[PDB]
Ligand binder design. Structure first.
Ligand SMILES: C[C@H](NC(=O)Cc1cc(F)cc(F)c1)C(=O)N[C@H]1CC=C[C@H](c2ccccc2)N(C)C1=O
Ligand SMILES: [Mn+2]
Length: 261
């Protein structure tokens, strides 16, 4: 039940994906000690609406109250911007951005470290990005999606870290979240053979301590159960005849947009 995208659809996703990447490029010099997450969010929302002529897919999405997700330290995902929440030296911060343009979605996220890195922070974020690039390099027609989760998990566990189970990447298009579910670990539950024209995200969430998570009073916010740090990165891709094209590359990404086999 995955439907593929036409060349006209894929080009609309290049546009939306580039816009999402550019938000993350735009926000970087604002991410420093003492800025609030609430300020960061309004800066991004203004940019999307009034500079990019587009709209945040997050804003109002099934109740989600802000325009981007901002998760710090032990928060794994869905962290909600708050004018009371000030960044501090050593914090690790994810910002996930999803833009809709001309009816198509582009979703991406990265980590930013505030001030001077802690040793554990620097290593966690690096391992997490490397786990994603390892997965991107596997994508091509005829492989099973299950291989990708298995590879991510093996790599991450060899570094003495854990892979979050309950949240995952996803198909993406005219909708924010479509088939398939993209697990970051090995599971019987995955059985999907990639074909050209499929679009989806990969977005591993890696914990420093154990894998288990808990859900907060606000509903949305997910933290680590052992209160260790957690990190994530994401890109949106399209499967090509011989590999993949990454649709959300930033200038600070260290991999080409096309991967060929
Ligand atoms: C971590 C990722 N993050 C995002 O997609 C970014 C995001 C930003 C935002 F502002 C509002 C959002 F709901 C989601 C994710 O939520 N993935 C989803 C994929 C599909 C379905 C569900 C699901 C669960 C709870 C809420 C929504 C979907 N599961 C289990 C997931 O793991
Ligand atoms: Mn996503």
């Amino acid at each position: 039940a995955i439907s593929i995208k036409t060349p006209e659809d894929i080009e609309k996703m290049r546009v939306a994906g580039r816009l999402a990447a550019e938000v993350l490029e735009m926000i970087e010099p604002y991410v420093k000690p003492g800025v609030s997450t609430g300020e960061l969010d309004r800066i991004c929302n203004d940019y999307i609406v009034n500079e990019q002529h587009a709209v945040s897919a997050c804003l109002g999405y099934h109740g989600y109250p802000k325009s981007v997700c901002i998760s710090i330290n032990e928060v794994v995902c869905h962290g909600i911007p708050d004018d009371a929440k000030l960044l501090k030296d050593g914090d690790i911060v994810n910002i996930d951005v999803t833009v809709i343009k001309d009816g198509f979605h582009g979703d991406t996220s990265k980590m930013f470290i505030v001030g001077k890195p802690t040793i554990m922070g620097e290593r966690l974020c690096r391992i997490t990005q490397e786990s994603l690039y390892l997965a991107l390099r596997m994508v091509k027609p005829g492989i099973n999606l299950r291989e990708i989760g298995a590879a991510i998990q093996k790599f991450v566990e060899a570094e003495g870290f854990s892979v979050v189970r309950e949240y995952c990447g996803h198909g993406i298009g005219r909708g924010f979240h479509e088939e398939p579910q993209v697990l970051h670990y090995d599971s019987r539950e995955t059985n999907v053979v990639l074909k050209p024209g499929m679009t989806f995200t990969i977005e591993p969430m890696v914990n420093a301590g154990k894998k288990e998570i808990r859900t907060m009073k606000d509903g949305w916010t997910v933290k680590t159960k052992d209160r260790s740090l957690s990190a994530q990165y994401e890109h949106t891709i399209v499967v090509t005849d011989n590999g993949c094209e990454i649709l959300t590359l930033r200038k600070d990404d260290t991999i080409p947009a096309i991967i060929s086999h």
